[PDB]
Design a binder for this molecule. Sequence first.
Ligand SMILES: CCN(CC)c1ccc(C(=O)c2ccccc2C(=O)O)c(O)c1
Ligand SMILES: CCN(CC)c1ccc(C(=O)c2ccccc2C(=O)O)c(O)c1
Length: 1168
Amino acid sequence: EQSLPFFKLFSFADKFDYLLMFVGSLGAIVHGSSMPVFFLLFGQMVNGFGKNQMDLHQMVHEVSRYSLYFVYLGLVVCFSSYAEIACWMYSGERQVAALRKKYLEAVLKQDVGFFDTDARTGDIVFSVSTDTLLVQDAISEKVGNFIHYLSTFLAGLVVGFVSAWKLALLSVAVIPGIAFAGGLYAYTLTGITSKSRESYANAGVIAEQAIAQVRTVYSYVGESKALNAYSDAIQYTLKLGYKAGMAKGLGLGCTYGIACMSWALVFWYAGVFIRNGQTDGGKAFTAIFSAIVGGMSLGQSFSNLGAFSKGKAAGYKLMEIINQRPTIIQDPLDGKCLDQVHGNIEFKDVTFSYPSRPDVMIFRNFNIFFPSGKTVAVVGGSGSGKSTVVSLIERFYDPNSGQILLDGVEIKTLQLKFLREQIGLVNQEPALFATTILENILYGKPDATMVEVEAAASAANAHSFITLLPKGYDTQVGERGVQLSGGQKQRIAIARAMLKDPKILLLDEATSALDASSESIVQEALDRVMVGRTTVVVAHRLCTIRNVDSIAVIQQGQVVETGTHEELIAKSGAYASLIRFQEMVENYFYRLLKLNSPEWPYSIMGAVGSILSGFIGPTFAIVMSNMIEVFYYTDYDSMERKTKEYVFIYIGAGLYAVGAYLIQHYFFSIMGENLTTRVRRMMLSAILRNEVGWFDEDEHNSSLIAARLATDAADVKSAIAERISVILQNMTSLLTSFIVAFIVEWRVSLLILGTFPLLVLANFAQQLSLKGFAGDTAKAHAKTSMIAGEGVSNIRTVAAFNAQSKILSLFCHELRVPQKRSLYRSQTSGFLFGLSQLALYGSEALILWYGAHLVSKGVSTFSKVIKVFVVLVITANSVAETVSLAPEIIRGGEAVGSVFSVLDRQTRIDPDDADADPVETIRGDIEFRHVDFAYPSRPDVMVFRDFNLRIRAGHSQALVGASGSGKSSVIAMIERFYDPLAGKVMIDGKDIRRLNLKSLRLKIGLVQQEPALFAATIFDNIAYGKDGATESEVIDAARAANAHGFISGLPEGYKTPVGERGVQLSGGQKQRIAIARAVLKNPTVLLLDEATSALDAESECVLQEALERLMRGRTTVVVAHRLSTIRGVDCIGVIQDGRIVEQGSHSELVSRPEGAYSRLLQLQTHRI
Ligand SMILES: CCN(CC)c1ccc(C(=O)c2ccccc2C(=O)O)c(O)c1
Ligand SMILES: CCN(CC)c1ccc(C(=O)c2ccccc2C(=O)O)c(O)c1
């Protein structure tokens, strides 16, 4: 960790931002100290009502003046809350932006050796893209919110203890029980959720391995143990979900009951103090509510400390590269700018080792002379760090031992400003920049005109990707629409190097894109551009090696031989090995509800529970208003009885909550968990039925599919269980509150009726204030972050051409747009929040004024205005949640999109077809008509061109891999992993696509290539090929596979975990189990697949005794790229790029003098 302290994180503050922070803090304190003052004014107006019941002259003036004070308070909140959101959020944008401009400069100042081509560059780009966002959260409006809510607590206590210290002390002493109950509830919820996830880590995870190893499960009957096991696993998750739903019960009910008891106690003490003669009704209420709010605000105040630690750590991580001192210092004074460059580069015993891994040695005793104005090249035997000279010449690593002389002048005695111009680099795949092609050329020389650009393009023939463009000299490679990669690229690096017109040029192995006509074109382009230059070429193939004046061959640390191509080929001096190696190369909601048809009895009893629970708020508000009126009785005798009755009402309501809440939250949880289990079972049953090719897509891999099937499905519950209880409860509370409010008094309730939109909008704004007004801050900064990431990932190219000063000229001019967007967002949010709060506090001063006016005329009476005001305000409070859940109702699929995306997806091949004819017996004949296929992952490949083959019944075939010319593709076409794009597949006198292949695959077996085993013991693993596992043939399988002397010799016997659990066996012995599983099936047709030398065991004691059983009485087809233990007996064919031309036994193939078998003989001799 070693995190930086919270202070000094503002160290990037301008002299103007301090004023912004000061104004923000000053506004925040005032905005936080407002609610208690609102309670004080409300208490004063209640006192004005109470004290003047028999004199309707003073009360009018008091209500008028207090309504005016409410108007003033609303104005203050309007002009204070705006200074908290408009001065803190903006100040959090002028610092992070001012920090990135320094951070990227620091990154681009360091040496290239710091990025040693690994995950370090990924870490740096992740820090740039994501970590600065975390820094921006610790200095944004979160600190303003924290100050706001702490000042609220302080002001509440102050406006508390001063009024009536006893009542405030009671109020602050009763809240610890509620806080402790809430903490216990949260801890229990977290523990139960963790236990549920750990239970989900049980066999409910085996779905991912079944999906990954889908080829083997489709090869056998499968689809039964893969689903029954999943159901048995998810049963436990269902049970723990029931327990979790229970936990969502007693916790909330007990908290509400303790709250109700506390309210009853505090009101009873207020009522016993009021009759003594200490305080008044308008003061005890003020003290109680101020103390309650002050106590409750501290919990929200401390909720912001979570992000502060992350922000501190993020700031510490950033403040590491900033203060780093570069190893190489660019001092213009030390280096004297020279001229008359010649091109003499000479080594003086330059031995260097990488600082990251100094154990290895790279250039032990390195001494080769580079002539001026002459072409030389160095070629290595293999890829043993060949691309190392380029880094050393361009000064990316300081030579620890040795010296490099440039025209007799040491490079270390020169500044790194004008030296880099003399060297041009074209490395392996020089990544272009996602800008216009016009300014890509300008990197060589910032000051250039169009004519030299055209001359450079013509020199490198940069016209086949430029002249015939949709628009002139305008194309963004990063943009998808004009993405013009197209495999090979007309290398613009050639043109940008020619623009410099240097005398030293560097070229790496830039031929790795299926050398073709375009490669030849760029080859003669290069041959044109090497004129009078000290070019150095590194490559592996000998095509470019021939066109070199002098060739240097290195083996390790030093050059083994020099001379020229005609000399190396002579006498085979240190060159026969080189050529030997070279030659060896939406209606969703209705149907979701319909899916819960068997949950009919568990929905009604939850709905009635929600309806019953909906009667909590209005009754509590009614009792509060009634007791508020009761406090002002003249005769003290009836007060005791009324308060006792109301305390009894509170005590009853506590148990009513401890009831109704559990009743609501239990059955709904049951229904949600049942729905999740059903949808998960159906999802797996549908995804396993899908075709093989849909699994091959890069978007659809095992990890993402498992994540969607494991995590996304849970959200379905939140879309059908939690999202329906709250709406019903709030709606019924709203209705039952309006009914009572209208019954009590209607002519005053109409004013509130006309003004619910204002109060609801204001409370919605208050609710949104807790989340933050910034909004999706990553989307705005993604465009800027792309520039930094692309400049860091391509550090090799930007290091040359002196492009460091140019990157921080587009970065600065592009960073300004998010700043303006943030400023506009901040201003709009502040103004709207201020207007909303003014509407809130400006409307409550009208209802009370009209109520007082009505009382003055005698039409209405006290105990009626206050009731309809309090109950209606409290019920308008609840509408905020209903409004907040609105955007996630109509806009379905926001997170719950996988529920029907793959469940209702239509397949092309249905394994179980009722109309398909059943398959009883098969003779075992394989033949293909004129059929070709293309992989669905990338249909551009068209290797198959009119493919045909035949294997007679009761025979064997020995197809050769033929250098991987689609060798592992015929294995996937004999049985229906894929479908023929054209032509017909012929078998057993019937077309393949009219028979029930589920009944057909049970008679055909194959052998896997890459070893893989299920997370289960090997008793049914070898019995997976048949239904019914009896030890009689279990031992027989081990004897046939010859694993009986090995598997049964294990100390723990057969009952042992062999997959990704318990003991992990070697990869060279999993083929024993693989071949043991096949013998149980005893298929009429057998398939083999050996490739990539998966055995790696000389004198195999497995294949020799198993292949003999393999041929006996079976039609076997074998494909392999190795001429070892693949001796055919009936017919052998050779495939060349998706086509065969010769057929017959091994005698015919060996009878050919040379034929196509000579190439296979070459590799056979290579095996030796
Ligand atoms: C934030 C949740 N929370 C802290 C644990 C609660 C929850 C409930 C209460 C009740 O006082 C209460 C609030 C409003 C309306 C009625 C009632 C009621 O009396 O049931 C409370 O004070 C605090
Ligand atoms: C003066 C009476 N009065 C104006 C009509 C109210 C009453 C209640 C609230 C609630 O916000 C509230 C206050 C404190 C604790 C919990 C809660 C709660 O959420 O139930 C309020 O804002 C204003």
